[PDB]
Amino acid sequence: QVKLQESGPGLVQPSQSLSITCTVSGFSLTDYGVHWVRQSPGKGLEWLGVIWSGGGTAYTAAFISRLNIYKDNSKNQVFFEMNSLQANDTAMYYCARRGSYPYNYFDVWGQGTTVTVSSAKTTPPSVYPLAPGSAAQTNSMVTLGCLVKGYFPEPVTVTWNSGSLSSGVHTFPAVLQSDLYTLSSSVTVPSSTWPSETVTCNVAHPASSTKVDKKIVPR
Amino acid sequence: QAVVTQESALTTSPGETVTLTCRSSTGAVTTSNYANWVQEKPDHLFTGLIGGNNNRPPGVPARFSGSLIGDKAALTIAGTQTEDEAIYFCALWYSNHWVFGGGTRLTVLGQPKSSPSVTLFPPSSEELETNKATLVCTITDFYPGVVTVDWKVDGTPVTQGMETTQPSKQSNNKYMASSYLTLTARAWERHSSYSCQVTHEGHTVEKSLSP
Ligand SMILES: O=C(O)CN1CCN(CC(=O)O)CCN(CC(=O)O)[C@@H](Cc2ccc([N+](=O)[O-])cc2)CN(CC(=O)O)CC1
Ligand SMILES: [Cl-]
Ligand SMILES: [Gd+3]
């Protein structure tokens, strides 16, 4: 029922700003407070600020002049706006809901906006279809793959047959091969389904707005 | 501002009672600090566990209780379960701001053992047209999350080109990982046997390839 959906680009150059929108559903901003918290790769949770139900705000002292949080109750949206970002502002940013007593807990959180602060320019991924080595045995299981090579920054979303295939899917975490990320994804389907029918990995790099589909064909 | 200190990590076996602490650097933690506890699960998913007045959200198990023990805040888990493996964060209120502690990673031992499922993938034809060749070795369904990956080209151990991920959790609480072997188009044409040897709990399972 209750969700906080986040939308923010990701790539910010040093000394420039960050803007993230938290769109809520299943509750009203007139009844709940919305907090903003971040998590740096080498640290834990850092609380940044909050906009309470009444429109009142509070912030961590070091952030008063660089961070603002405001809202539009009618649009069910909370806006996070931070200026003068530096390299150590690179983190996953979250909006979290918190009610008044007896609902005074950080129950529901947004999935997070990945923010990377660097001078580096965006690099779209090169997506390669991974077909098996040997041929499949009559009536068996086959594992097809998708290599998502050399992209900057994080994240990337991989789906198979536009999200229709999920049960036999595994999407692996990335490696950092000299300032570029590479990850893989695989799907396991029966031999009666492939190459008889079409299996396609759909890769999206939101931080470059490229959407690529690569059909898996026999080697 | 104030630093909130928590134990770095704790390790328990199922059914054990554990107490995680949350300490304030500026003095005693009191009810006016309204100590909250939040749980972080794999893939950066956060959920509230305990509220400002030691109240649990609907659906949070009764084994989780918040309290003040002397000068600090505490989270008692009365009978640790496998699903409680996570990172626990406390948050303290200081009149006009919240401060989160550094988090306590809880590891729960004695979970069912499972050997890895390995798959070795050959480089794409579309990749060889850019004169590059990457071999992917996917490691799936293993517990404990500790694995060593060794690569061989015709039986000869490889030096460079290899990069391996640190194991992370799957949807079924077991672990996954992947290992790459970035090579050149010409080096791929010369050698014939490629082996991805995955070592887990002293045992090795391997997948080979031949063009
Ligand atoms: O709530 C808001 O808009 C913002 N609050 C700002 C501060 N709070 C942190 C935060 O909100 O970040 C910490 C204190 N709050 C408990 C909690 O948050 O854990 C409550 C303490 C209280 C005093 C007196 C009575 N009484 O009945 O006299 C009832 C409750 C009071 N806040 C209502 C509520 O939360 O119930 C109102 C103000
Ligand atoms: Cl108050
Ligand atoms: Gd309050």
GROMACS .gro file of C-alpha atoms and ligand atoms in nm:
model
  470
    1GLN     CA    1   0.000   0.000   0.000
    2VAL     CA    2   0.262   0.257   0.126
    3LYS     CA    3   0.555   0.357  -0.100
    4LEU     CA    4   0.805   0.640  -0.139
    5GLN     CA    5   0.931   0.654  -0.500
    6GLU     CA    6   1.257   0.831  -0.573
    7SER     CA    7   1.374   1.010  -0.889
    8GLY     CA    8   1.707   1.189  -0.913
    9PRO     CA    9   1.973   1.168  -1.196
   10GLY     CA   10   2.281   1.048  -1.009
   11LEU     CA   11   2.584   1.219  -1.170
   12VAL     CA   12   2.684   1.551  -1.011
   13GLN     CA   13   3.008   1.741  -1.082
   14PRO     CA   14   3.198   1.891  -0.779
   15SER     CA   15   3.056   2.227  -0.656
   16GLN     CA   16   2.722   2.177  -0.829
   17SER     CA   17   2.378   2.077  -0.699
   18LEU     CA   18   2.173   1.765  -0.635
   19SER     CA   19   1.796   1.751  -0.662
   20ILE     CA   20   1.585   1.447  -0.568
   21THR     CA   21   1.208   1.405  -0.562
   22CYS     CA   22   1.032   1.163  -0.324
   23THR     CA   23   0.679   1.085  -0.448
   24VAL     CA   24   0.469   0.920  -0.180
   25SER     CA   25   0.158   0.697  -0.204
   26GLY     CA   26  -0.060   0.511   0.047
   27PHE     CA   27  -0.046   0.802   0.295
   28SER     CA   28  -0.056   1.179   0.312
   29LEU     CA   29   0.226   1.425   0.378
   30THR     CA   30  -0.014   1.616   0.605
   31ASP     CA   31   0.008   1.324   0.855
   32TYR     CA   32   0.367   1.203   0.822
   33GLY     CA   33   0.716   1.343   0.844
   34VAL     CA   34   0.968   1.258   0.569
   35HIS     CA   35   1.337   1.225   0.657
   36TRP     CA   36   1.641   1.229   0.429
   37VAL     CA   37   1.927   0.996   0.509
   38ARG     CA   38   2.235   0.891   0.313
   39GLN     CA   39   2.479   0.596   0.316
   40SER     CA   40   2.839   0.638   0.188
   41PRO     CA   41   3.010   0.313   0.059
   42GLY     CA   42   3.269   0.325   0.339
   43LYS     CA   43   3.026   0.429   0.618
   44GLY     CA   44   2.680   0.374   0.770
   45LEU     CA   45   2.372   0.595   0.794
   46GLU     CA   46   2.400   0.972   0.813
   47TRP     CA   47   2.085   1.171   0.890
   48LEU     CA   48   2.054   1.490   0.685
   49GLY     CA   49   1.715   1.644   0.754
   50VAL     CA   50   1.336   1.621   0.781
   51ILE     CA   51   1.014   1.789   0.684
   52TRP     CA   52   0.746   1.726   0.945
   53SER     CA   53   0.372   1.694   0.879
   54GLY     CA   54   0.314   2.061   0.962
   55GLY     CA   55   0.578   2.183   0.715
   56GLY     CA   56   0.835   2.242   0.989
   57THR     CA   57   1.194   2.140   0.919
   58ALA     CA   58   1.513   2.027   1.096
   59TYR     CA   59   1.865   1.962   0.970
   60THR     CA   60   2.208   1.837   1.080
   61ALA     CA   61   2.400   2.157   1.173
   62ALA     CA   62   2.674   2.121   0.906
   63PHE     CA   63   2.403   2.116   0.638
   64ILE     CA   64   2.195   2.430   0.719
   65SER     CA   65   2.343   2.642   0.437
   66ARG     CA   66   2.374   2.372   0.175
   67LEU     CA   67   2.057   2.166   0.224
   68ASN     CA   68   1.689   2.241   0.186
   69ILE     CA   69   1.386   2.016   0.210
   70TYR     CA   70   1.040   2.137   0.111
   71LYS     CA   71   0.714   1.985  -0.007
   72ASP     CA   72   0.387   2.004  -0.197
   73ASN     CA   73   0.117   1.820   0.003
   74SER     CA   74  -0.128   1.821  -0.292
   75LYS     CA   75   0.122   1.652  -0.527
   76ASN     CA   76   0.231   1.402  -0.254
   77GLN     CA   77   0.591   1.515  -0.322
   78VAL     CA   78   0.890   1.602  -0.104
   79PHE     CA   79   1.193   1.774  -0.262
   80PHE     CA   80   1.557   1.740  -0.151
   81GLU     CA   81   1.791   2.013  -0.280
   82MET     CA   82   2.157   2.026  -0.180
   83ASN     CA   83   2.420   2.259  -0.323
   84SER     CA   84   2.802   2.259  -0.343
   85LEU     CA   85   2.855   1.880  -0.362
   86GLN     CA   86   3.205   1.738  -0.316
   87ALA     CA   87   3.360   1.390  -0.365
   88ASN     CA   88   3.260   1.275  -0.012
   89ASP     CA   89   2.891   1.346  -0.089
   90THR     CA   90   2.895   1.033  -0.307
   91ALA     CA   91   2.631   0.810  -0.147
   92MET     CA   92   2.295   0.636  -0.170
   93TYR     CA   93   2.025   0.890  -0.065
   94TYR     CA   94   1.698   0.784   0.098
   95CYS     CA   95   1.371   0.941   0.200
   96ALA     CA   96   1.205   0.769   0.497
   97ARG     CA   97   0.859   0.815   0.642
   98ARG     CA   98   0.803   0.868   1.017
   99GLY     CA   99   0.473   0.922   1.193
  100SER     CA  100   0.367   1.076   1.521
  101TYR     CA  101   0.311   0.862   1.838
  102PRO     CA  102   0.214   0.567   1.819
  103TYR     CA  103   0.350   0.557   1.462
  104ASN     CA  104   0.684   0.716   1.556
  105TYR     CA  105   0.924   0.484   1.374
  106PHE     CA  106   1.109   0.496   1.040
  107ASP     CA  107   0.891   0.216   0.900
  108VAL     CA  108   0.886   0.262   0.523
  109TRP     CA  109   1.187   0.379   0.326
  110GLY     CA  110   1.242   0.459  -0.041
  111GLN     CA  111   1.474   0.228  -0.245
  112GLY     CA  112   1.739   0.499  -0.270
  113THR     CA  113   1.897   0.729  -0.527
  114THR     CA  114   2.259   0.645  -0.618
  115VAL     CA  115   2.461   0.966  -0.637
  116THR     CA  116   2.813   0.986  -0.774
  117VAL     CA  117   3.015   1.302  -0.750
  118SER     CA  118   3.290   1.306  -1.014
  119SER     CA  119   3.440   1.509  -1.300
  120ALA     CA  120   3.423   1.194  -1.516
  121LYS     CA  121   3.183   1.182  -1.812
  122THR     CA  122   2.915   0.915  -1.852
  123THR     CA  123   3.001   0.598  -2.044
  124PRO     CA  124   2.720   0.381  -2.189
  125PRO     CA  125   2.757   0.001  -2.159
  126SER     CA  126   2.850  -0.239  -2.438
  127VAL     CA  127   2.598  -0.525  -2.405
  128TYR     CA  128   2.706  -0.867  -2.528
  129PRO     CA  129   2.489  -1.185  -2.568
  130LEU     CA  130   2.635  -1.488  -2.391
  131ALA     CA  131   2.534  -1.818  -2.555
  132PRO     CA  132   2.654  -2.154  -2.401
  133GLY     CA  133   2.979  -2.329  -2.497
  134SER     CA  134   2.859  -2.677  -2.597
  135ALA     CA  135   2.517  -2.759  -2.750
  136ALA     CA  136   2.227  -2.866  -2.524
  137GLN     CA  137   2.121  -3.226  -2.464
  138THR     CA  138   1.775  -3.340  -2.585
  139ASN     CA  139   1.525  -3.226  -2.315
  140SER     CA  140   1.739  -3.040  -2.056
  141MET     CA  141   1.806  -2.694  -1.904
  142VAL     CA  142   2.004  -2.410  -2.068
  143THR     CA  143   2.163  -2.104  -1.913
  144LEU     CA  144   2.192  -1.791  -2.133
  145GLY     CA  145   2.378  -1.479  -2.034
  146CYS     CA  146   2.414  -1.106  -2.085
  147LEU     CA  147   2.742  -0.917  -2.031
  148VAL     CA  148   2.702  -0.545  -1.950
  149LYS     CA  149   3.057  -0.411  -2.004
  150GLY     CA  150   3.224  -0.079  -1.923
  151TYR     CA  151   2.971   0.171  -1.784
  152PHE     CA  152   3.002   0.470  -1.548
  153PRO     CA  153   2.833   0.546  -1.307
  154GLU     CA  154   2.606   0.305  -1.117
  155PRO     CA  155   2.322   0.178  -1.151
  156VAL     CA  156   2.207  -0.046  -1.438
  157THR     CA  157   1.886  -0.248  -1.464
  158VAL     CA  158   1.867  -0.581  -1.642
  159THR     CA  159   1.546  -0.764  -1.736
  160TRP     CA  160   1.474  -1.066  -1.956
  161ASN     CA  161   1.191  -1.065  -2.214
  162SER     CA  162   1.082  -0.721  -2.082
  163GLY     CA  163   1.042  -0.848  -1.727
  164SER     CA  164   0.840  -1.157  -1.819
  165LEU     CA  165   1.122  -1.394  -1.710
  166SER     CA  166   1.221  -1.376  -1.342
  167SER     CA  167   1.229  -1.716  -1.170
  168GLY     CA  168   1.544  -1.847  -1.338
  169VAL     CA  169   1.724  -1.511  -1.329
  170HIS     CA  170   2.042  -1.407  -1.142
  171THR     CA  171   2.190  -1.058  -1.174
  172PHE     CA  172   2.543  -1.036  -1.037
  173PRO     CA  173   2.705  -0.733  -0.863
  174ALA     CA  174   2.960  -0.518  -1.050
  175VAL     CA  175   3.340  -0.513  -1.062
  176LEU     CA  176   3.542  -0.193  -1.103
  177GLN     CA  177   3.792  -0.245  -1.388
  178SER     CA  178   3.985   0.089  -1.385
  179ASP     CA  179   3.710   0.355  -1.339
  180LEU     CA  180   3.449   0.151  -1.534
  181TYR     CA  181   3.188  -0.098  -1.406
  182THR     CA  182   3.101  -0.439  -1.551
  183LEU     CA  183   2.827  -0.679  -1.439
  184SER     CA  184   2.653  -0.987  -1.577
  185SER     CA  185   2.309  -1.143  -1.570
  186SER     CA  186   2.189  -1.492  -1.655
  187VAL     CA  187   1.862  -1.679  -1.707
  188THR     CA  188   1.802  -2.055  -1.696
  189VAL     CA  189   1.520  -2.186  -1.921
  190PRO     CA  190   1.438  -2.535  -2.063
  191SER     CA  191   1.584  -2.640  -2.404
  192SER     CA  192   1.229  -2.661  -2.546
  193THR     CA  193   1.199  -2.283  -2.496
  194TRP     CA  194   1.541  -2.183  -2.643
  195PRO     CA  195   1.647  -2.159  -2.936
  196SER     CA  196   1.289  -2.248  -3.036
  197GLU     CA  197   1.164  -1.914  -2.895
  198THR     CA  198   1.329  -1.575  -2.848
  199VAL     CA  199   1.510  -1.486  -2.523
  200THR     CA  200   1.622  -1.122  -2.494
  201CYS     CA  201   1.808  -0.929  -2.219
  202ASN     CA  202   1.701  -0.563  -2.186
  203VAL     CA  203   1.966  -0.338  -2.034
  204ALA     CA  204   1.907   0.019  -1.917
  205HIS     CA  205   2.165   0.273  -1.795
  206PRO     CA  206   1.937   0.547  -1.638
  207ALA     CA  207   2.235   0.782  -1.599
  208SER     CA  208   2.288   0.791  -1.980
  209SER     CA  209   1.924   0.715  -2.075
  210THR     CA  210   2.027   0.432  -2.312
  211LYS     CA  211   1.794   0.132  -2.345
  212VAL     CA  212   1.939  -0.166  -2.534
  213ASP     CA  213   1.790  -0.507  -2.617
  214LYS     CA  214   2.014  -0.796  -2.722
  215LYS     CA  215   1.858  -1.122  -2.845
  216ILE     CA  216   2.045  -1.442  -2.752
  217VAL     CA  217   2.131  -1.646  -3.064
  218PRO     CA  218   2.326  -1.980  -3.088
  219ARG     CA  219   2.707  -1.970  -3.104
  220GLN     CA  220   2.766   1.713   1.688
  221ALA     CA  221   2.724   1.396   1.899
  222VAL     CA  222   2.866   1.060   1.795
  223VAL     CA  223   2.641   0.758   1.847
  224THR     CA  224   2.842   0.437   1.897
  225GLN     CA  225   2.724   0.079   1.834
  226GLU     CA  226   2.917  -0.256   1.830
  227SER     CA  227   3.070  -0.312   1.483
  228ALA     CA  228   2.939  -0.665   1.445
  229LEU     CA  229   2.798  -0.952   1.646
  230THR     CA  230   2.782  -1.322   1.567
  231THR     CA  231   2.522  -1.561   1.715
  232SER     CA  232   2.380  -1.909   1.656
  233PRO     CA  233   1.999  -1.957   1.614
  234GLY     CA  234   1.796  -1.933   1.933
  235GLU     CA  235   2.049  -1.721   2.119
  236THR     CA  236   1.960  -1.401   2.299
  237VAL     CA  237   2.170  -1.100   2.201
  238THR     CA  238   2.179  -0.736   2.320
  239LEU     CA  239   2.304  -0.462   2.082
  240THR     CA  240   2.393  -0.127   2.242
  241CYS     CA  241   2.362   0.237   2.130
  242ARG     CA  242   2.578   0.488   2.318
  243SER     CA  243   2.582   0.869   2.321
  244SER     CA  244   2.916   1.062   2.330
  245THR     CA  245   2.763   1.366   2.503
  246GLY     CA  246   2.626   1.175   2.801
  247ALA     CA  247   2.358   0.925   2.907
  248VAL     CA  248   2.091   0.814   2.659
  249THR     CA  249   1.749   0.903   2.808
  250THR     CA  250   1.381   0.871   2.703
  251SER     CA  251   1.411   1.224   2.564
  252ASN     CA  252   1.648   1.079   2.298
  253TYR     CA  253   1.353   0.865   2.173
  254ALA     CA  254   1.582   0.579   2.059
  255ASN     CA  255   1.470   0.424   1.726
  256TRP     CA  256   1.605   0.106   1.564
  257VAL     CA  257   1.610   0.042   1.189
  258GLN     CA  258   1.700  -0.279   1.005
  259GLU     CA  259   1.898  -0.295   0.680
  260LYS     CA  260   1.854  -0.609   0.467
  261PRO     CA  261   2.067  -0.704   0.154
  262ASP     CA  262   2.026  -0.487  -0.156
  263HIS     CA  263   2.007  -0.170   0.063
  264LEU     CA  264   1.650  -0.228   0.188
  265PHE     CA  265   1.567  -0.052   0.517
  266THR     CA  266   1.271  -0.121   0.749
  267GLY     CA  267   1.175   0.018   1.090
  268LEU     CA  268   1.200  -0.215   1.388
  269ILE     CA  269   1.149  -0.006   1.704
  270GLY     CA  270   1.002   0.339   1.756
  271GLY     CA  271   1.060   0.636   1.986
  272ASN     CA  272   0.863   0.486   2.276
  273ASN     CA  273   0.991   0.127   2.236
  274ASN     CA  274   0.696   0.049   2.010
  275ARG     CA  275   0.711  -0.207   1.729
  276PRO     CA  276   0.552  -0.148   1.384
  277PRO     CA  277   0.275  -0.397   1.281
  278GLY     CA  278   0.443  -0.721   1.174
  279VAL     CA  279   0.778  -0.679   1.350
  280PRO     CA  280   0.835  -0.998   1.560
  281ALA     CA  281   0.794  -0.978   1.936
  282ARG     CA  282   1.154  -1.109   1.986
  283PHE     CA  283   1.274  -0.755   1.908
  284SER     CA  284   1.246  -0.516   2.204
  285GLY     CA  285   1.400  -0.176   2.268
  286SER     CA  286   1.508  -0.041   2.607
  287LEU     CA  287   1.749   0.172   2.807
  288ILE     CA  288   2.009  -0.021   3.010
  289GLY     CA  289   2.186   0.218   3.244
  290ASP     CA  290   2.330   0.503   3.037
  291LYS     CA  291   2.270   0.348   2.691
  292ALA     CA  292   1.995   0.236   2.450
  293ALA     CA  293   1.958  -0.133   2.361
  294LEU     CA  294   1.794  -0.377   2.124
  295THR     CA  295   1.737  -0.723   2.262
  296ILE     CA  296   1.663  -1.005   2.015
  297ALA     CA  297   1.520  -1.289   2.226
  298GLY     CA  298   1.597  -1.596   2.019
  299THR     CA  299   1.791  -1.498   1.708
  300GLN     CA  300   1.656  -1.631   1.379
  301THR     CA  301   1.823  -1.689   1.041
  302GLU     CA  302   1.615  -1.406   0.888
  303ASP     CA  303   1.757  -1.160   1.152
  304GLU     CA  304   2.094  -1.156   0.975
  305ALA     CA  305   2.117  -0.785   0.885
  306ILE     CA  306   2.268  -0.453   0.985
  307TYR     CA  307   2.102  -0.276   1.280
  308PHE     CA  308   2.103   0.099   1.312
  309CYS     CA  309   1.990   0.301   1.613
  310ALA     CA  310   1.899   0.670   1.591
  311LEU     CA  311   1.903   0.920   1.877
  312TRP     CA  312   1.712   1.250   1.900
  313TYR     CA  313   1.900   1.557   2.030
  314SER     CA  314   1.640   1.841   2.066
  315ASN     CA  315   1.662   1.949   1.697
  316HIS     CA  316   1.834   1.669   1.497
  317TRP     CA  317   1.866   1.290   1.476
  318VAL     CA  318   2.199   1.109   1.471
  319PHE     CA  319   2.240   0.750   1.352
  320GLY     CA  320   2.486   0.509   1.508
  321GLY     CA  321   2.745   0.333   1.289
  322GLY     CA  322   2.547   0.010   1.266
  323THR     CA  323   2.580  -0.344   1.400
  324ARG     CA  324   2.606  -0.627   1.149
  325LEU     CA  325   2.451  -0.943   1.294
  326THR     CA  326   2.568  -1.277   1.155
  327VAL     CA  327   2.364  -1.588   1.240
  328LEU     CA  328   2.559  -1.917   1.214
  329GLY     CA  329   2.443  -2.277   1.166
  330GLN     CA  330   2.252  -2.218   0.839
  331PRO     CA  331   2.220  -2.508   0.583
  332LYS     CA  332   2.536  -2.583   0.381
  333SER     CA  333   2.517  -2.560  -0.002
  334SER     CA  334   2.780  -2.613  -0.274
  335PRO     CA  335   2.821  -2.374  -0.575
  336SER     CA  336   2.660  -2.400  -0.917
  337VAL     CA  337   2.913  -2.286  -1.179
  338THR     CA  338   2.857  -2.172  -1.539
  339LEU     CA  339   3.137  -2.070  -1.777
  340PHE     CA  340   3.045  -1.844  -2.071
  341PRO     CA  341   3.254  -1.795  -2.392
  342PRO     CA  342   3.313  -1.444  -2.537
  343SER     CA  343   3.056  -1.297  -2.773
  344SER     CA  344   3.114  -1.267  -3.150
  345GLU     CA  345   3.002  -0.903  -3.128
  346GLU     CA  346   3.284  -0.853  -2.876
  347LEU     CA  347   3.554  -1.009  -3.095
  348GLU     CA  348   3.470  -0.750  -3.363
  349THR     CA  349   3.599  -0.482  -3.123
  350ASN     CA  350   3.909  -0.705  -3.075
  351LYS     CA  351   3.829  -0.781  -2.708
  352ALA     CA  352   3.736  -1.113  -2.538
  353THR     CA  353   3.581  -1.159  -2.190
  354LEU     CA  354   3.500  -1.493  -2.024
  355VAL     CA  355   3.231  -1.490  -1.755
  356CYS     CA  356   3.218  -1.741  -1.471
  357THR     CA  357   2.898  -1.719  -1.272
  358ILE     CA  358   2.894  -1.873  -0.923
  359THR     CA  359   2.548  -1.936  -0.777
  360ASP     CA  360   2.365  -2.094  -0.473
  361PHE     CA  361   2.649  -2.127  -0.220
  362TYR     CA  362   2.666  -2.116   0.161
  363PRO     CA  363   2.897  -2.005   0.340
  364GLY     CA  364   2.969  -1.693   0.136
  365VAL     CA  365   3.340  -1.762   0.096
  366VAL     CA  366   3.489  -1.867  -0.235
  367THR     CA  367   3.824  -1.868  -0.419
  368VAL     CA  368   3.834  -1.849  -0.800
  369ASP     CA  369   4.132  -1.982  -1.000
  370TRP     CA  370   4.168  -1.949  -1.381
  371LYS     CA  371   4.367  -2.169  -1.623
  372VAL     CA  372   4.463  -2.128  -1.993
  373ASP     CA  373   4.558  -2.477  -2.131
  374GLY     CA  374   4.633  -2.586  -1.773
  375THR     CA  375   4.867  -2.288  -1.719
  376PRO     CA  376   4.765  -2.046  -1.431
  377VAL     CA  377   4.665  -1.692  -1.541
  378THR     CA  378   4.826  -1.371  -1.413
  379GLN     CA  379   4.640  -1.056  -1.533
  380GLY     CA  380   4.298  -0.982  -1.685
  381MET     CA  381   4.110  -1.140  -1.393
  382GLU     CA  382   3.865  -0.956  -1.166
  383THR     CA  383   3.633  -1.127  -0.914
  384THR     CA  384   3.337  -0.990  -0.714
  385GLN     CA  385   3.302  -1.032  -0.338
  386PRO     CA  386   3.001  -1.262  -0.259
  387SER     CA  387   2.658  -1.103  -0.208
  388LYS     CA  388   2.318  -1.249  -0.112
  389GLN     CA  389   2.061  -1.393  -0.354
  390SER     CA  390   1.682  -1.381  -0.309
  391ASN     CA  391   1.695  -1.724  -0.140
  392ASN     CA  392   1.953  -1.615   0.126
  393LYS     CA  393   2.235  -1.815  -0.039
  394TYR     CA  394   2.529  -1.636  -0.206
  395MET     CA  395   2.628  -1.548  -0.560
  396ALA     CA  396   2.944  -1.409  -0.723
  397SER     CA  397   3.108  -1.368  -1.065
  398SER     CA  398   3.462  -1.376  -1.206
  399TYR     CA  399   3.596  -1.231  -1.529
  400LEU     CA  400   3.895  -1.305  -1.752
  401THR     CA  401   3.951  -1.016  -1.991
  402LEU     CA  402   4.168  -1.124  -2.283
  403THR     CA  403   4.266  -1.010  -2.632
  404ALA     CA  404   4.109  -1.144  -2.957
  405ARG     CA  405   4.441  -1.299  -3.068
  406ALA     CA  406   4.511  -1.469  -2.731
  407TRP     CA  407   4.164  -1.627  -2.756
  408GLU     CA  408   4.249  -1.770  -3.101
  409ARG     CA  409   4.576  -1.930  -2.982
  410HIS     CA  410   4.472  -2.116  -2.663
  411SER     CA  411   4.210  -2.395  -2.662
  412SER     CA  412   4.129  -2.507  -2.305
  413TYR     CA  413   3.985  -2.256  -2.056
  414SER     CA  414   3.898  -2.362  -1.702
  415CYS     CA  415   3.716  -2.175  -1.424
  416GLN     CA  416   3.796  -2.350  -1.099
  417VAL     CA  417   3.576  -2.248  -0.808
  418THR     CA  418   3.694  -2.352  -0.461
  419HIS     CA  419   3.442  -2.357  -0.173
  420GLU     CA  420   3.491  -2.528   0.168
  421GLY     CA  421   3.810  -2.700   0.046
  422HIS     CA  422   3.614  -2.863  -0.240
  423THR     CA  423   3.656  -2.760  -0.604
  424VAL     CA  424   3.397  -2.778  -0.883
  425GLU     CA  425   3.502  -2.675  -1.235
  426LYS     CA  426   3.361  -2.589  -1.575
  427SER     CA  427   3.572  -2.606  -1.890
  428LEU     CA  428   3.546  -2.452  -2.236
  429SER     CA  429   3.688  -2.527  -2.584
  430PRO     CA  430   3.630  -2.331  -2.914
  431LIG     O1  431   0.601   1.495   1.523
  431LIG     C1  432   0.641   1.594   1.466
  431LIG     O2  433   0.583   1.656   1.368
  431LIG     C2  434   0.780   1.648   1.511
  431LIG     N1  435   0.813   1.632   1.656
  431LIG     C3  436   0.948   1.690   1.674
  431LIG     C4  437   1.037   1.609   1.763
  431LIG     N2  438   1.026   1.458   1.760
  431LIG     C5  439   1.125   1.391   1.665
  431LIG     C6  440   1.082   1.391   1.516
  431LIG     O3  441   0.961   1.409   1.490
  431LIG     O4  442   1.169   1.373   1.431
  431LIG     C7  443   1.059   1.406   1.894
  431LIG     C8  444   0.944   1.408   1.994
  431LIG     N3  445   0.821   1.328   1.950
  431LIG     C9  446   0.840   1.178   1.966
  431LIG    C10  447   0.909   1.108   1.849
  431LIG     O5  448   0.915   1.167   1.742
  431LIG     O6  449   0.957   0.996   1.868
  431LIG    C11  450   0.702   1.369   2.032
  431LIG    C12  451   0.717   1.382   2.191
  431LIG    C13  452   0.585   1.413   2.264
  431LIG    C14  453   0.575   1.519   2.360
  431LIG    C15  454   0.451   1.548   2.425
  431LIG    C16  455   0.330   1.472   2.397
  431LIG     N4  456   0.208   1.500   2.459
  431LIG     O7  457   0.109   1.430   2.429
  431LIG     O8  458   0.203   1.592   2.541
  431LIG    C17  459   0.343   1.366   2.300
  431LIG    C18  460   0.466   1.337   2.236
  431LIG    C19  461   0.642   1.499   1.979
  431LIG     N5  462   0.616   1.507   1.834
  431LIG    C20  463   0.486   1.439   1.801
  431LIG    C21  464   0.496   1.286   1.795
  431LIG     O9  465   0.596   1.235   1.733
  431LIG    O10  466   0.409   1.217   1.849
  431LIG    C22  467   0.601   1.651   1.799
  431LIG    C23  468   0.723   1.713   1.741
  432CL      CL  469   0.938   1.758   2.130
  433GD      GD  470   0.790   1.366   1.678
   0.00000   0.00000   0.00000
